[PDB]
Design a protein around this motif. Structure first.
Motif, PDB file in Angstrom:
ATOM      1  N   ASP E   2       5.136  -5.458   8.622  1.00 25.77           N
ATOM      2  CA  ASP E   2       5.108  -5.404  10.074  1.00 25.77           C
ATOM      3  C   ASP E   2       5.264  -3.960  10.544  1.00 25.77           C
ATOM      4  N   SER E   3       4.972  -3.735  11.823  1.00 31.06           N
ATOM      5  CA  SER E   3       5.041  -2.396  12.390  1.00 31.06           C
ATOM      6  C   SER E   3       6.483  -1.928  12.521  1.00 31.06           C
ATOM      7  N   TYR E   4       7.418  -2.712  11.995  1.00 30.79           N
ATOM      8  CA  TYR E   4       8.785  -2.256  11.823  1.00 30.79           C
ATOM      9  C   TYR E   4       9.075  -1.869  10.386  1.00 30.79           C
ATOM     10  N   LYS E   5       8.235  -2.307   9.451  1.00 31.11           N
ATOM     11  CA  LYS E   5       8.260  -1.785   8.094  1.00 31.11           C
ATOM     12  C   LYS E   5       7.385  -0.552   7.944  1.00 31.11           C
ATOM     13  N   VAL E   6       6.325  -0.446   8.744  1.00 35.36           N
ATOM     14  CA  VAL E   6       5.372   0.649   8.602  1.00 35.36           C
ATOM     15  C   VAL E   6       6.018   1.979   8.963  1.00 35.36           C
ATOM     16  N   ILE E   7       6.567   2.085  10.167  1.00 33.51           N
ATOM     17  CA  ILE E   7       7.176   3.326  10.630  1.00 33.51           C
ATOM     18  C   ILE E   7       8.663   3.277  10.319  1.00 33.51           C
ATOM     19  N   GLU E   8       9.100   4.128   9.399  1.00 32.08           N
ATOM     20  CA  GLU E   8      10.450   4.049   8.865  1.00 32.08           C
ATOM     21  C   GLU E   8      11.436   4.949   9.594  1.00 32.08           C
ATOM     22  N   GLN E   9      11.136   6.238   9.712  1.00 32.95           N
ATOM     23  CA  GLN E   9      12.051   7.184  10.333  1.00 32.95           C
ATOM     24  C   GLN E   9      11.256   8.317  10.951  1.00 32.95           C
ATOM     25  N   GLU E  21       6.481  20.582  19.603  1.00 31.09           N
ATOM     26  CA  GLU E  21       6.503  21.492  20.740  1.00 31.09           C
ATOM     27  C   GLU E  21       5.150  22.162  20.957  1.00 31.09           C
ATOM     28  N   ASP E  22       4.691  22.935  19.975  1.00 29.78           N
ATOM     29  CA  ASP E  22       3.443  23.676  20.128  1.00 29.78           C
ATOM     30  C   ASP E  22       2.229  22.810  19.813  1.00 29.78           C
ATOM     31  N   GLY E  23       2.159  22.284  18.590  1.00 24.32           N
ATOM     32  CA  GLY E  23       0.959  21.607  18.142  1.00 24.32           C
ATOM     33  C   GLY E  23       0.737  20.248  18.763  1.00 24.32           C
ATOM     34  N   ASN E  24       1.762  19.676  19.396  1.00 24.41           N
ATOM     35  CA  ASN E  24       1.684  18.340  19.988  1.00 24.41           C
ATOM     36  C   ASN E  24       1.409  17.290  18.910  1.00 24.41           C
ATOM     37  N   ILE E  25       2.292  17.261  17.916  1.00 26.03           N
ATOM     38  CA  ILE E  25       2.083  16.487  16.701  1.00 26.03           C
ATOM     39  C   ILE E  25       3.400  15.818  16.341  1.00 26.03           C
ATOM     40  N   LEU E  26       3.407  14.494  16.289  1.00 24.67           N
ATOM     41  CA  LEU E  26       4.598  13.770  15.884  1.00 24.67           C
ATOM     42  C   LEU E  26       4.624  13.623  14.371  1.00 24.67           C
ATOM     43  N   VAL E  27       5.721  14.047  13.762  1.00 21.86           N
ATOM     44  CA  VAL E  27       5.921  13.923  12.327  1.00 21.86           C
ATOM     45  C   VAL E  27       6.752  12.676  12.080  1.00 21.86           C
ATOM     46  N   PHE E  28       6.247  11.783  11.237  1.00 19.82           N
ATOM     47  CA  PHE E  28       6.928  10.539  10.916  1.00 19.82           C
ATOM     48  C   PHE E  28       7.050  10.383   9.410  1.00 19.82           C
ATOM     49  N   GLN E  29       7.917   9.467   9.001  1.00 21.13           N
ATOM     50  CA  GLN E  29       7.981   9.009   7.623  1.00 21.13           C
ATOM     51  C   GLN E  29       7.582   7.544   7.609  1.00 21.13           C
ATOM     52  N   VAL E  30       6.555   7.212   6.835  1.00 27.45           N
ATOM     53  CA  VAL E  30       6.043   5.851   6.804  1.00 27.45           C
ATOM     54  C   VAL E  30       6.192   5.304   5.395  1.00 27.45           C
ATOM     55  N   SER E  31       5.777   4.062   5.185  1.00 26.68           N
ATOM     56  CA  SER E  31       5.980   3.435   3.890  1.00 26.68           C
ATOM     57  C   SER E  31       4.843   3.781   2.937  1.00 26.68           C
ATOM     58  N   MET E  32       5.172   3.797   1.648  1.00 23.99           N
ATOM     59  CA  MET E  32       4.231   4.155   0.595  1.00 23.99           C
ATOM     60  C   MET E  32       3.050   3.205   0.503  1.00 23.99           C
ATOM     61  N   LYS E  33       3.003   2.167   1.331  1.00 23.91           N
ATOM     62  CA  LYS E  33       1.898   1.224   1.321  1.00 23.91           C
ATOM     63  C   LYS E  33       1.000   1.318   2.542  1.00 23.91           C
ATOM     64  N   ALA E  34       1.458   1.930   3.628  1.00 23.83           N
ATOM     65  CA  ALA E  34       0.639   2.040   4.824  1.00 23.83           C
ATOM     66  C   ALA E  34      -0.549   2.957   4.580  1.00 23.83           C
ATOM     67  N   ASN E  35      -1.580   2.802   5.396  1.00 24.49           N
ATOM     68  CA  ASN E  35      -2.743   3.668   5.351  1.00 24.49           C
ATOM     69  C   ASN E  35      -3.053   4.194   6.752  1.00 24.49           C
ATOM     70  N   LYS E  36      -3.992   5.134   6.817  1.00 22.20           N
ATOM     71  CA  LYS E  36      -4.302   5.835   8.055  1.00 22.20           C
ATOM     72  C   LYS E  36      -4.837   4.926   9.150  1.00 22.20           C
ATOM     73  N   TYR E  37      -5.134   3.658   8.861  1.00 20.40           N
ATOM     74  CA  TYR E  37      -5.458   2.691   9.905  1.00 20.40           C
ATOM     75  C   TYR E  37      -4.194   2.059  10.473  1.00 20.40           C
ATOM     76  N   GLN E  38      -3.319   1.583   9.585  1.00 21.92           N
ATOM     77  CA  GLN E  38      -2.088   0.941  10.019  1.00 21.92           C
ATOM     78  C   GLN E  38      -1.162   1.917  10.726  1.00 21.92           C
ATOM     79  N   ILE E  39      -1.114   3.170  10.283  1.00 25.21           N
ATOM     80  CA  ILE E  39      -0.256   4.146  10.946  1.00 25.21           C
ATOM     81  C   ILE E  39      -0.716   4.366  12.381  1.00 25.21           C
ATOM     82  N   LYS E  40      -2.017   4.589  12.560  1.00 21.50           N
ATOM     83  CA  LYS E  40      -2.594   4.719  13.890  1.00 21.50           C
ATOM     84  C   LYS E  40      -2.257   3.512  14.752  1.00 21.50           C
ATOM     85  N   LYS E  41      -2.497   2.313  14.218  1.00 22.93           N
ATOM     86  CA  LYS E  41      -2.233   1.084  14.961  1.00 22.93           C
ATOM     87  C   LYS E  41      -0.773   0.992  15.391  1.00 22.93           C
ATOM     88  N   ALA E  42       0.150   1.150  14.439  1.00 22.05           N
ATOM     89  CA  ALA E  42       1.569   0.982  14.729  1.00 22.05           C
ATOM     90  C   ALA E  42       2.055   1.989  15.759  1.00 22.05           C
TER      91      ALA E  42
END
Lengths: 62, 59, 122, 106, 86
Positions: E2-9, E21-42
């Motif tokens: 679930d999107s509570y397992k996908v985005i961890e911290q 601040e500058d680049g307008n880029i959120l840095v996240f830690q996700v699960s070793m199973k998510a992919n660039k589709y699920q991360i975008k979605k979540a």
RNA sequence: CGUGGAGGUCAGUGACGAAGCCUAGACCGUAAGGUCGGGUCGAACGGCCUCUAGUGCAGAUCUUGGUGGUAGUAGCAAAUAUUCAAAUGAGAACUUUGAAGACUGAAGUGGGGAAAGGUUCCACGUCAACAGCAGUUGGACGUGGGUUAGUCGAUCCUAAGA
């Protein structure tokens, strides 16, 4: 102090080797605080760090 | 400090799930909080609450 | 506590010790037996003169095949040297003992070294 | 006693017979020895412009005579030299030949 | 997942806190199973934003880190303020 | 004569100090051995009648562990080579900066990779051990940061072969 890091970064910013940067010896405690390429870009701008021109190899005899 | 099994043993099959998502949201925000707080004892209660609900759901 | 054999009065005395030091046993035994029995200020002057090669230390027991010098006449030998590390350790322990005696309130002008002993660490 | 004199050190006869690798590293000690003998001090410091004129021509190309200038001065705090030191410096002359020893006024 | 397992911290080192601040880029830690589709979605579903791209890397410690860039109509400073950490 | 354990007795010795250990102090026996005194020490141990055995060492180029003389001795001699001043520091031949002197000499003592290694990369602090002198230095020690792909690789194809 220890300006090894500052020498390295200064040489990488100016575009020369570590053998062609001049770190002023009277202002050691200003370079001690420059730990970013921005600060070094300020020091080279004002004059505390210079570029040390190239040794000649003439061809007159040739 | 948590849920009780004989409490949960009558609730409807939907309030259970909504409770699950509430507790999981709570844990999700709690991780971000603990990213700064020294030590928090609400985690051990919320995990066992999730589990005590999932047990009755399965049953 | 429990120093080696020391026959003296324990009220007019001070002690100092150091264990597990990274010095040479053979070299330190000689620079201890050199000042053994002297007065305090005289011994400290002597150890200060040794560090400038103005005076020497007579190597009397651990002395195989070392070289002769002219600074061994004062004592009656030919073989002598200048162990710097050992002289530094000994002249630190001596200052410690002097400070301890001052604490106990003894008269520094009468102090002679009455016991000094070295042996081997593991 | 603060004082300042000029000297000519005959450096030819103090290096006669030395290995080529160690001639310029040895004029240094010979000059410190010179200054200690003359100014009677124990601390001797050489200006870094005397180093350049000793090493001008490499290890084995030291000059024959050097015109020097020595000053006895008073040392500052945290001194153990009681309380004097010498400062040796080079002087500029056409030749270094034919000059006696004089006293500089301040 | 679930999107509570996908985005961890979220990642809160002061080198990462400069991209937001500058680049307008959120840095996240996700699960070793998510992919660039699920991360975008979540991300899109949790914070109602416009994701422009996602880059990922499996760190030496073992987990997986995501660089999620937002569009010119949002502000990662404010979104990280809403999440709480700044 | 002495040793570990077993049956019987001496209503045996003992924290007011059992056993052990030290002792050019003492007494007994031809001897193997036995008994006292003094020092240290801290919880169990003997005499006599018998039973029993993994029962007594100077050697086996004996086994395991520990320790000497040699000995502050042989030694630390490849790669031409370092010097001055200041700064930091308890402390500087060896760390940092500036100045000079040399070297590799484009088949380099330079700039990149494959395999292999696995955090050695970077910052901060720090010296118990280690880097065969030293050390404030370090690939060491402690704490954190760091690797972003539709176009570069794998992924796809088949070769010898399985």
């Amino acid at each position: 102090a220890n300006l090894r890091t500052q020498k390295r970064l200064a040489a990488s910013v100016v575009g020369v080797g570590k053998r062609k940067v001049w770190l002023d010896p009277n202002e050691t405690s200003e370079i001690a605080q420059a730990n970013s390429r921005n600060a070094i870009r300020k020091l080279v701008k004002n004059g505390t760090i210079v570029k040390k021109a190239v040794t000649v190899h003439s061809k007159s005899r040739t | 400090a948590g849920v009780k099994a004989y409490e949960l043993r009558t609730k409807s099959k939907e309030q259970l799930a909504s409770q699950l998502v509430d507790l999981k949201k709570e844990l999700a925000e709690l991780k971000v909080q603990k990213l700064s707080r020294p030590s928090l004892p609400k985690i051990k209660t919320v995990r066992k609450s999730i589990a005590c609900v999932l047990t009755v759901i399965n049953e | 506590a429990r120093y080696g054999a020391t026959s003296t009065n324990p009220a007019k005395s001070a002690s100092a010790r150091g264990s597990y030091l990274r010095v040479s046993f053979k070299n330190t035994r000689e620079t201890a037996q050199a000042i053994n029995g002297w007065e305090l200020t005289k011994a400290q002057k002597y150890l200060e003169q040794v560090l400038d090669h103005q005076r020497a230390i007579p190597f009397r027991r651990f002395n195989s095949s070392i070289g002769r010098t002219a600074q061994g006449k004062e004592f009656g030998v030919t073989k002598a040297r200048w162990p710097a590390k050992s002289v530094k350790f000994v002249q630190g322990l001596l200052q410690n003992a002097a400070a301890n005696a001052e604490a106990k309130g003894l008269d520094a002008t009468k102090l002679y070294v009455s016991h000094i002993q070295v042996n081997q660490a593991p | 006693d603060v004082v300042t004199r000029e000297y000519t050190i005959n450096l030819h006869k103090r290096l006669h017979g030395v290995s080529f690798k160690k001639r310029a590293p040895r004029a240094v000690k010979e000059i410190k020895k010179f200054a200690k003998l003359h100014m009677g001090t124990d601390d001797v410091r050489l200006a870094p412009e005397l180093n350049q004129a000793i090493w001008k021509r490499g290890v084995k190309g030291v000059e024959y005579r050097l015109r020097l200038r020595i000053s006895r001065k008073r040392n500052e705090e945290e001194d153990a030299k009681n309380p004097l030191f010498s400062y040796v410096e080079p002087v500029l002359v056409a030749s270094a030949k034919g000059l006696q020893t004089v006293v500089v006024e301040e | 997942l679930d999107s509570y397992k996908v985005i961890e911290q979220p990642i809160t080192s002061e080198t990462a806190m400069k991209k937001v601040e500058d680049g307008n880029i959120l840095v996240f830690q996700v699960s070793m199973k998510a992919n660039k589709y699920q991360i975008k979605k979540a991300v899109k579903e949790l914070y109602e934003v416009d994701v422009l791209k996602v880059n990922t890397l499996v760190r030496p410690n073992g987990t997986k880190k995501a660089y999620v860039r937002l569009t010119a109509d949002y502000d990662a400073l404010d979104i990280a303020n809403r999440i709480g950490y700044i």
